[PDB]
Paper text:
After the outbreak of SARS-CoV-2, we and others illustrated that the structural elements in the SARS-CoV-2 genome can also be targeted to suppress virus replication. Specifically, we discovered that some coumarin derivatives can be repurposed to selectively bind to a single G bulge in 5′ UTR of SARS-CoV-2 without retaining splicing modulatory activities or binding to GA-rich loops. Here, we report a novel class of coumarin derivatives exhibiting selective binding affinity towards single G RNA bulges. Harnessing the computational power of all-atom Gaussian accelerated molecular dynamics simulations, we unveiled a rare minor groove binding mode of the ligand with a key interaction between the coumarin moiety and the G bulge.
To explore the binding of specific RNA G bulge ligands, we performed all-atom simulations using the GaMD method on binding of three coumarin derivatives to the model hairpin RNA5 with a G bulge (see simulation details in “Materials and methods” section).
Numbering used by the authors:
A (entry chain D): 20 to 156, 162 to 241
B (entry chain C): 20 to 231
The structure:
RNA sequence: CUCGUCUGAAACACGGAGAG
């Protein structure tokens, strides 16, 4: 199974530097071109840089030339993006993508990693508070409110991932305070509310915050 | 560098419709054009490469075509799972460049929201803030109006809304509205109501509770 | 050797192919 796993994202001060890693498995980057592509929140895909196999030639978008440096370590089977003099305009999800095999897919990028968010801001990290949205007076809705955190993102799961049907985790909204807030809800049978427990699991990696919140009637 | 101009920026079409997305290159890119599909919050996936070749595993309803510098992505019979943003990309010249994307919405029958209201938790009330949440579940179309009333007084300036992306199976939306008050203001009033207006509702639906 | 081309896990450099 081909996999690309980005890491190294997070909060960085304007003017700061940060290195992203793209760890490949299931194939060797020595034989493929590897590309970095970024996507600012709500916006389009933007090509950033690439590195070619056999030659190790490197190429850059004009908006990053002179500030970013792409490289690869074949023994570690990992590609890197060194980012210097970061600005707010560089805030984005950064994806690593494999350009596929020429005979099979031309120059298309045939496998993409999940992406890692880079936030360029002077604001301080802040962990969330998690509050229950309790069910009350056929179907019942319940959820959890994840309030007052920075930066993005948070991951919410229910019953440690056993429960996905009926779940809606809403996009975060930026409050007037500069802190994010989001809710996650799930609809469940009302006949089970007295015997089926429901726990919302919240992880805010930037602040090393993990919270499980029981949601009861 | 080579500009890829993509049109339209968004479209809405019914299941079974033929959808066509266009991308014009600012100079020749030979046939070195790929098309990707991106579900919200997900990694893009390759659909078409070399302008007209279908990437293996992709359904045959997707096709690509080239005419000079104009490139087209066609979905011959749209399905609910085709909700996505679609991007063209040229690989003829470094720097590679992407089109701005086309957001494709699935147009389905009208569906009224199920409305729920949640009082603030006692845990939150221990601090100085009270959040009241109104949930609009599984509706279409996306336009919906939520109004908050406290003791029948219309609220302004103190709520925020978020909407989910279109569901890839039933083509509906859900929406959360959060009213934020100081604990003092929450304690000084009794009736909390969210009034919902939607094309699926013949009259506005109000869900309310009494503090206590 | 050359290439606004193709191929070798390969947009450039390199090997091979094709044409000159
Ligand atoms: Cl904190
Ligand atoms: Cl098929
Ligand atoms: Cl033309
Ligand atoms: Cl009272």
């Amino acid at each position: 199974e081909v996999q690309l796993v980005e890491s190294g994202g997070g909060l960085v001060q304007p003017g700061g530097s940060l290195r992203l890693s793209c760890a490949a498995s299931g194939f060797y980057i020595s034989y493929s071109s590897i590309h970095w592509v970024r996507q600012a929140p709500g916006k389009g895909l933007e090509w950033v840089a690439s590195i070619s196999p056999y030659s190790g030639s490197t190429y850059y978008a004009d908006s990053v030339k002179g500030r970013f440096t792409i490289s690869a370590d074949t023994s570690k089977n990992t590609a890197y993006l060194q980012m210097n003099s970061l600005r707010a305009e560089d805030t984005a999800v950064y994806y690593c993508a494999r350009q596929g095999y020429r005979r099979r897919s031309g120059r298309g990028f045939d496998y993409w990693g999940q992406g890692t968010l880079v936030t360029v801001s002077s604001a301080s990290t802040k962990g969330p508070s998690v509050f229950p949205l309790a069910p009350s007076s056929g179907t019942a809705a319940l959820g959890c409110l994840v309030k007052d955190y920075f930066p993005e993102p948070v991951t919410v799961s229910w019953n440690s991932g056993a429960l996905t049907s009926g779940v809606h985790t809403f996009p975060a909204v930026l409050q007037s305070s500069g802190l994010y807030s989001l809710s996650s809800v799930v609809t469940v049978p009302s006949s089970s509310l007295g015997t089926q427990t429901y726990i919302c699991n919240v992880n805010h990696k930037p602040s090393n915050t993990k919270v499980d919140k029981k949601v009861e009637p | 560098d080579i500009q890829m101009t993509q049109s339209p920026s968004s479209l809405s079409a019914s299941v079974g419709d033929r959808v066509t997305i266009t991308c014009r290159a600012s100079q020749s890119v030979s046939s070195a054009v790929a098309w990707y599909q991106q579900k919200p919050g997900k990694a893009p996936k390759l659909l078409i490469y070399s302008a007209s070749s279908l990437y293996s595993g992709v359904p045959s309803r997707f096709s690509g075509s080239r005419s000079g510098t104009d490139f087209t992505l066609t979905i011959s019979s749209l399905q609910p799972e085709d909700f996505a943003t679609y991007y063209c990309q040229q690989s003829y010249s470094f720097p590679n460049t992407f089109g701005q994307g086309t957001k494709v919405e699935i147009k389905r029958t009208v569906a009224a929201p199920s409305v729920f209201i949640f009082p603030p938790s006692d845990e939150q009330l221990k601090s100085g803030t009270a959040s009241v949440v109104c949930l609009l579940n599984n509706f279409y179309p996306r336009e919906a109006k939520v109004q908050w009333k406290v003791d029948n007084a219309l609220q302004s300036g103190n709520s925020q809304e978020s909407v989910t992306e279109q569901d890839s199976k039933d083509s509906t939306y859900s929406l959360s509205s959060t009213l934020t008050l100081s604990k003092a203001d929450y304690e000084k009033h009794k009736v909390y109501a969210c009034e919902v207006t939607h094309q699926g509702l013949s009259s506005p639906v109000t869900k309310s509770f009494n503090r206590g």
